Amino acid sequence: SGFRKMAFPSGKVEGCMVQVTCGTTTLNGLWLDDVVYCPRHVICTSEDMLNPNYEDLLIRKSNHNFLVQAGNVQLRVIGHSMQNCVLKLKVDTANPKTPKYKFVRIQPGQTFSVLACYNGSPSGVYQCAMRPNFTIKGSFLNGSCGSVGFNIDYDCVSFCYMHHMELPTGVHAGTDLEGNFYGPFVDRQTAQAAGTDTTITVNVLAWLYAAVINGDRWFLNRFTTTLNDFNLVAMKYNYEPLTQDHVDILGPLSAQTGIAVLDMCASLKELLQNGMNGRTILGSALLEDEFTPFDVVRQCSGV
Amino acid sequence: SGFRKMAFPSGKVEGCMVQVTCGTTTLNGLWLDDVVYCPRHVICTSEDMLNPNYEDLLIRKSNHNFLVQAGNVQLRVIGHSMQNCVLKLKVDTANPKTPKYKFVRIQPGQTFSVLACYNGSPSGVYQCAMRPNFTIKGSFLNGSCGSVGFNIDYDCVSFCYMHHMELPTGVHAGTDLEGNFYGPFVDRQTAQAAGTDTTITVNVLAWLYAAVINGDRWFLNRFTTTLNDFNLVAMKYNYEPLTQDHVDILGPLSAQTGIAVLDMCASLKELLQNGMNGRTILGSALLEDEFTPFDVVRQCSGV
Ligand SMILES: *[C@H](O)[C@H](C[C@@H]1CCNC1=O)NC(=O)[C@H](CC(C)C)NC(=O)OCc1ccccc1Cl
Ligand SMILES: *[C@H](O)[C@H](C[C@@H]1CCNC1=O)NC(=O)[C@H](CC(C)C)NC(=O)OCc1ccccc1Cl
Predict the structure, then answer these.
(1) Contacts of B237 in chain A (CB under 8 A)
(2) Sequence-ordered alpha helix ranges (H) in chain B
(3) How many Cβ atoms are within 10 Å of B67's Cβ, its own excluded?
(4) Are strands B35-39 and B86-91 parallel, antiparallel or unpaired?
(5) Any atom of ligand 2 within 6 Å of the Cβ of B162
(6) Is A91 in a helix, a strand, or coil?
(7) Which residues does chain B break after (C to N > 2.5 Å)?
(8) From CA B233, how far away is CA B228, in angstroms rounded?
(9) CA-to-CA distance for B96 and B98, rounded, in angstroms?
(10) What effect is documented for mutating residue 189 to A (chains A, B)?
(11) Partners of residue B142 in chain A, C-beta under 8 Å
């Protein structure tokens, strides 16, 4: 028992992190087979960074412009290309620690683990949710670009995020591993705003189910509501609408607890209208929306 | 920028996790050099578990009673001994992935990363604080015993925790890697209660400094108080007393923000008396005490 925000063990990804240097800029790269992937803005200089023409910048580079370092061993670059906002550096050595992997793009509301890295060296691991506005609430300092986000599924690493930038609100933006940004962001030193965000309703309900499984029951009630009536409450509090497929995804949790989804929605309605009255749920005094139904099932099956 | 509860990258510990089986009981072990460490209650049966005599139980075992498995490779046990509540199984192969390591016992209020494991296979990673009452608030299911807690410091892994049990309140208890319990707990199937807990004051103040560094300033005020006057407020709200050494540990954070510790204590005093009035600090609606000053400095130096 217990419920904790939990990252995937990071070992398989740690074995893939390298350091990529171009000029005076150094960031992280991801070394899979004989290709290193990193943010293309490593080829920027202090003048280009406001609005650089990356095709021009890459044409003016040669393989020897790129210093790649796998710990102490220097890797020899034998080719370079651009794929959207990611640079691909072909190297003369296949990474012997390459796991089984996929490049996957995730949906808003889904979670992944971030391995924060600096100078090719992993520093920490934590869980992030892709917000509805395509930002993540991370912890990134200078030198963290090229850190990746991932999920693990039977020894296969599904990479879904590479870090590129921070926004003025302190949230973070990046690309998939094909180099395509999540959200309407671009890789240059401009003041970019994320769209308005919303709360991930299905995740809040999953977390309420986690709470029941772990013994927090004070917010439950005898009431049940309808899908249409709940979605009216959801719009008023800036929550996403609940779909029938969401009810179906929550099926296993509703089954394990014996609490119908629309029974739990009545509890959420009262929580939104009344607050918590000084009480906590799973150690929080606000409603948490960064746990997926999958995340909850992962920790709550044996309880 | 951003501030997130962050675990250490788990790769060095992942390479040490094995599965230990004795009879029908299976849990995790920690394989360092040619010794595997695991909870001694793996040698219990369904009848002994209420109050077993472990010296008797181990005398009645032989090396072939222990099935050790490093993934698919079976490890041959060539010796066994007991050290307090930990069993030490000597094996015929030194773990080639053994990191530089220490066995360290941590103090209440300090944090560590937990690598949750099942059947020798790592499942997730998260951060825990040792509570003043020597429990941790983890996430552990059946089969998780032998999972370890650790910190990493320049490629040296300091192991500080091995998991043994869950208490009726849903919190967790275990030993150091010498097999000595944290707290007044024993490894048997009895209903054990933890002592009353208290809030780790120095950690709350460190987290308030993290908040300022990240731009949360609404709780600040022009007031300053004295150490003696703050500690009177601390006792009323079940907070630990603040010592001069705590003020000194917070020195770097006070320096970086230009906010004296006793200036921040005045803010904490008002927060304790008035609450938050619907506002949040670093995404929380309660005062967080599981971040050490060290944890904060790790994420807040570049900001
Ligand atoms: C890459 O390492 C870096 C990550 C930033 C640095 C601070 N926190 C982060 O997440 N990306 C950038 O610096 C990015 C470069 C442009 C894409 C060319 N710019 C950016 O994020 O602008 C904001 C910024 C830049 C420097 C320091 C702090 C901040 Cl907020
Ligand atoms: C070891 O794997 C196990 C870890 C428990 C299992 C559920 N959550 C945990 O943290 N330890 C024990 O089962 C321990 C054995 C005795 C030390 C001999 N007993 C225990 O924790 O009692 C409580 C218990 C036991 C089984 C299931 C649930 C719970 Cl709460």
Answers:
(1) none
(2) 11-14, 54-59, 201-213, 227-236, 244-249, 251-257, 261-274, 293-300
(3) 14
(4) antiparallel
(5) no
(6) strand
(7) none
(8) 9
(9) 6
(10) Does not affect ability to cleave and inactivate human TRMT1
(11) 302
